[PDB]
Design a binder for this molecule. Structure first.
Ligand SMILES: O=P(O)(O)OC[C@H]1O[C@@](O)(CO)[C@@H](O)[C@@H]1O
Ligand SMILES: O=P(O)(O)OC[C@H]1O[C@@](O)(CO)[C@@H](O)[C@@H]1O
Ligand code: NA
Ligand code: NA
Lengths: 542, 542
């Protein structure tokens, strides 16, 4: 009996026929109305296909929804992951309020703080040289072994904060079961000077276990002494019984809690590899930026609340325009893994077909998130954003100042970012193009033949999120904005953003296929569909 | 008066209500009917939502279209890029037929061969040490400076063919105007031992020119002698007048032709950086694999023609299911830039709103191409592919054998690939899930509460493209398959796949914004919309 977000009312808001050029021409307060600031982040949503009526209508839907309650329930540790009967407490990982929070018999404040102190001590011991490898050498390289939630956040953040690397350690990420992943790391590191991290919430993920067994075999091939495992492996998991069973002791294990979703886990001990690159002080700054956004989200009325606006715009488009993707365009090289990271956060959360009650919903839920770094994307796929006939909401991320003094490059980067959003809004008409072609020296027949092909329809929406700089703090804030957008979207759609049951079937079928690949007289092999069977046969013959 | 592909007939084919499980159960020849082989590539399209009637209907549309003629026109150098009045002759770059081909007054066979010999000689001179830097040192590093078509193909192929690197040169790619791109290269190379390549078809791209000016300033800061430019720069372009004007002489310029689209240019001299990594012999093998697919495409009846089938399936889905994206899932780490590369090839080609005649089309054209490497994607966004409610055609790329002897890893990688396509096809029903939950030890109330959340609808389509190995030759074949798919799609939609007029407006607006950023008393600044204006003001204040 949850409020329906995607209803007939939303579908009709579209009939306002918003014309962006016309709104900016006539409304001298358009930017003031449709922008927000949070500390060093400027959120400009003024190039979206909205006016006062449309926005106020969307805000009224949020107000009428359960969102106000759900926000409190998330922060207070209510079991809002309702299919798994778990709290959803990635916010607690970065808390600076110190308000009382007792969940599942644990003092969450004490739990979080204590594990942070342990990670901090580990990083300090390793960087200072007090931790030595088994042959007594100082560690020079860190290898994280993990996949999905146990890989993407650390990998993305270590890249994004490259200018802040300061530990004299090189950090490597092994993830895919494809052994190329492991081998890219092992080919450039020395077993005597490498600390390996097995990062797995479940400690049962096939790829991570295979990779960890292979890494252990490599280490033991070198040392020929099982005691070497003590100086070269640590583990991050919620299943410490399984870590012990693997052969790593509890003093070498760093716990995470069931209420830390993998795709919201970089803030936890899974972030260890981040601290190994940029130091623990910078890790605390990352956390503190996220906290600032948590406080904003929890405390701010919806009309001035950045994640709530982000969520309403996105769900409005995918409802009323029936769009099936969103483009995210980060105009900074350092954010090269940001789209990949948010693909997991967004699509693994909101790619759900049933509501909280288990009923199949008759409205579309999460859409495809894609994009690419600017300005490169301008030369790859912005052609489609400008002249294709697919409706695609666009977010630009701009960074005002970079880490170097090539000011001309930085100015051009930003000019391009702002030009792309301006181009989406304005387009260029047939008459404008035709006149330009004449002025360029084409005759009338040539101008008439070409002009239609150069018309850019325009009136296409964008949001620009401008950061003062890409620091640990501002990056933490930026990621949290999207975490909360995703949350708000799932609440409005009445889905569970925090489970991921859809991946189970593939895991099961993968085990059966491995059996079939090893024994064609097996029941597994006989029960395959013939496409799978013939794919297995084609691999065997090669 | 071109045949309409997306017509009422296509929309009704869907009412066949194909059930994949049922087809495989009842049709013992399903795989034989809906798979093809080309040399070392197995193309299995049997898990697509088709039967004989649907496929034969699609094939009849291709037969009735202008496709047969268009294929000949492309290969023979007809000016099928009709808005620019240019031939489209990326196929000629890899030709092994040696058939006569004279286009725009040039013997294309002589032209292509001669430039290949020049690139081969350059690579050999540099690798052997006969080419020296200005201080007489042997070159150790190559830096490609280019964006889009002048970056992505070389970058993707150099990565994809990493095991075949053999020149003792390290190759770096500078692209974005964001100076982080340039600086990542310059921070790890010595000006005395680095050869820089300015790759730009037009020689007028803002980012590439800024990067090249900055790289030249770096080289001259070191040497303090303009004569050093001769030993440290070469250029690849179609505009040799502009290269001369920049300061590089013609003996240091490597030409490309107007009929080489940027997004189809890695086969030309733009591929120089590929040859610098893997040697010219392996570059010839890459070309030869593409040729094999060209020959297949040109000569094969449509029912047995892999690119034609790929194109018909893709356009059928986006027409009749109104899907707005396609997922591409390469199950090999080496293909980490393959999606990025095909995003340009596909979306920059087919993101068009007007037909050849300039009329706005009333059917959807190119859709969003996205995806990610497997098995990683399984832990990021396959949740949405399995349980979301977005219709998304899926292509899997599988590689039977890798470059190492971790056979257990390779077997698991493939098992996962095949399990994912099997899972898409089958799903798991409520009764199956409920019974599994009981067998796992849940009581009836718990099983009933959870089961709906674990249901995976299934009946979702995929294609699996299996290569024997990822060699220069097989990679060349694979890329060409997609090049021709894109071509066939554009022909059926009656659009020009080979222009890209949509990017022009942003370039123009970027110049005006740069003027506005430097002078707020300018006409440029006064004419801005207020969102752009306030973004510029926020950058200035920081
Ligand atoms: O090679 P150039 O001329 O520098 O152009 C770079 C890229 O920019 C484009 O988007 C055209 O602007 C692509 O088609 C092209 O490959
Ligand atoms: O950290 P783990 O338990 O190894 O799981 C890895 C990833 O796999 C999942 O797709 C679940 O299978 C993600 O939610 C998770 O982050
Ligand atoms: Na409410
Ligand atoms: Na025909």
């Amino acid at each position: 009996n949850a409020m329906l977000f995607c209803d007939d009312s939303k579908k009709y808001l579209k009939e306002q026929n918003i014309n962006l050029k016309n709104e900016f021409d006539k409304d001298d307060k358009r930017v003031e109305k449709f922008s927000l600031k949070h500390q060093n982040i400027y959120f400009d949503y003024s190039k979206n296909l909205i006016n006062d009526y449309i926005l106020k209508s969307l805000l009224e839907s949020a107000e009428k929804s359960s969102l106000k309650d759900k926000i409190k329930q998330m922060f207070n540790g209510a079991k809002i992951n309702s299919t798994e009967h778990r709290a959803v407490l990635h916010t607690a990982l970065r808390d600076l309020s110190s308000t009382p929070l007792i969940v599942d018999g644990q003092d969450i404040r004490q739990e979080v703080t204590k594990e942070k102190q342990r990670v901090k001590e580990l990083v300090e011991k390793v960087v200072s040289g007090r931790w030595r490898g088994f042959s007594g050498k100082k560690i020079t390289d860190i290898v994280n072994i993990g996949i999905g939630g146990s890989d993407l956040g650390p990998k993305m953040v270590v890249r994004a904060l490259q200018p802040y690397h300061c530990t004299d350690l090189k950090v490597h990420f092994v993830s895919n079961v494809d052994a190329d992943s492991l081998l890219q790391a092992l080919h450039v590191v020395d077993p005597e000077t490498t600390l390996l991290i097995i990062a797995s919430k479940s400690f049962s993920t096939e790829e991570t276990l295979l990779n960890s067994i292979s890494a252990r075999e490599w280490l033991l091939d070198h040392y020929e002494d099982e005691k070497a495992v003590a100086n070269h492996f640590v583990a991050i998991s919620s299943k410490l019984d399984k870590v012990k069973e693997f052969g790593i002791d509890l003093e070498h294990c760093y716990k995470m809690w069931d209420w830390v979703g993998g795709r919201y886990s970089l803030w936890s001990s899974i972030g260890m590899s981040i601290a190994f690159a940029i130091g623990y002080d910078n890790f605390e700054k990352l956390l503190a930026g996220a906290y600032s956004v948590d406080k904003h989200f929890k405390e701010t009325e919806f009309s001035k609340n950045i994640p709530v606006i982000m969520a309403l715009l996105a769900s409005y488009y995918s409802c009323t325009y029936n769009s099936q993707s969103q483009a995210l365009l980060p105009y900074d090289e350092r954010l090269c893994y940001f789209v990949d990271y948010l693909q997991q956060a967004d699509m693994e959360s909101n790619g759900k077909s049933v509501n909280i009650a288990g009923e199949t919903v008759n409205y579309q839920t999460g859409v495809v998130l894609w994009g690419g770094v600017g300005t490169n994307g301008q030369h790859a796929f912005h052609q489609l954003l400008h002249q294709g006939n697919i409706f695609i909401p666009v977010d630009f991320i701009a960074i005002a100042t970079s880490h170097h003094n090539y000011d001309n490059h930085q100015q051009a980067l930003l000019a391009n970012c702002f030009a792309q959003s301006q181009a989406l809004m304005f387009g260029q008409s047939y008459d404008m193009v035709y006149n330009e072609l004449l002025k360029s020296g084409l005759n009338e027949t040539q101008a008439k033949e070409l002009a239609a092909h150069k018309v850019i329809p325009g009136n296409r929406p964008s949001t620009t999120i401008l950061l003062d700089e890409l620091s640990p703090y501002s990056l933490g804030a930026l990621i949290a904005l999207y975490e909360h957008k995703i949350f708000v979207q799932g609440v409005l759609w009445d889905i569970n953003s925090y489970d991921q049951w859809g991946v189970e079937l593939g895991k099961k079928l993968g085990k059966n296929i491995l059996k079939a690949m090893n024994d064609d007289s097996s029941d597994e092999y006989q029960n395959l569909d013939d496409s799978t069977r013939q794919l297995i046969a084609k691999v065997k013959n090669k």
